[PDB]
Amino acid sequence: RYKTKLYLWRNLGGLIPEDMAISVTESITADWKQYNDMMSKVRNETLDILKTNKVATEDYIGYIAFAEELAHQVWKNKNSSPDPNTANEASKTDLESKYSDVYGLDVTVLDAIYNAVIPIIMG
Numbered sequence: 322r323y324k325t326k327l328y329l330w331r332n333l334g335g336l337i338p339e340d341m342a343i344s345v346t347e348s349i350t351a352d353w354k355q356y357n358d359m360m361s362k363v364r365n366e367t368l369d370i371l372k373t374n375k376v377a378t379e380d381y382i383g384y385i386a387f388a389e390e391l392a393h394q395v396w397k398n399k400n401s402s403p404d405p406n407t408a409n410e411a412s413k414t415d416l417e418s419k420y421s422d423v424y425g426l427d428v429t430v431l432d433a434i435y436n437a438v439i440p441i442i443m444g
């Protein structure tokens with residue numbers, strides 16, 4: 322008899338501790354800041370490479386787009402891959418083919434970008 326109401330204790334809803342909730346939002350904050358810092362590094366280092374190589378301004382979108390697609394594939398390798406290092410070199414090959422074949426981009430300039438983007442995403 323007294324047992325009937327005791328079941329209601331099991332699944333009863335209640336308040337969420339503020340400190341635990343703040344922990345959730347602080348990790349999200351950390352997420353977009355780390356994202357932005359990584360993005361600014363990749364962008365700024367690519368820009369330096371392009372300046373150094375006296376790349377035409379019409380080709381900036383091509384090289385920037387390359388650096389970004391490479392950085393994204395490298396992030397995926399770091400996470401999903403049991404051997405990120407092997408998949409990175411394969412991503413390099415894949416994207417360098419794509420961007421020189423389709424967009425006429427210079428592979429020695431793409432190699433420079435690669436060497437900048439890798440430590441940014443891996444470290």
Ligand SMILES: CCCCCCCCO[C@@H]1O[C@H](CO)[C@@H](O)[C@H](O)[C@H]1O
Binds near residue numbers: 336337338340
């Ligand atoms: C391990 C998680 C179990 C903790 C459940 C109790 C948390 C709810 O507890 C309540 O949280 C409110 C918001 O912080 C405060 O206003 C109350 O003083 C606090 O007792």
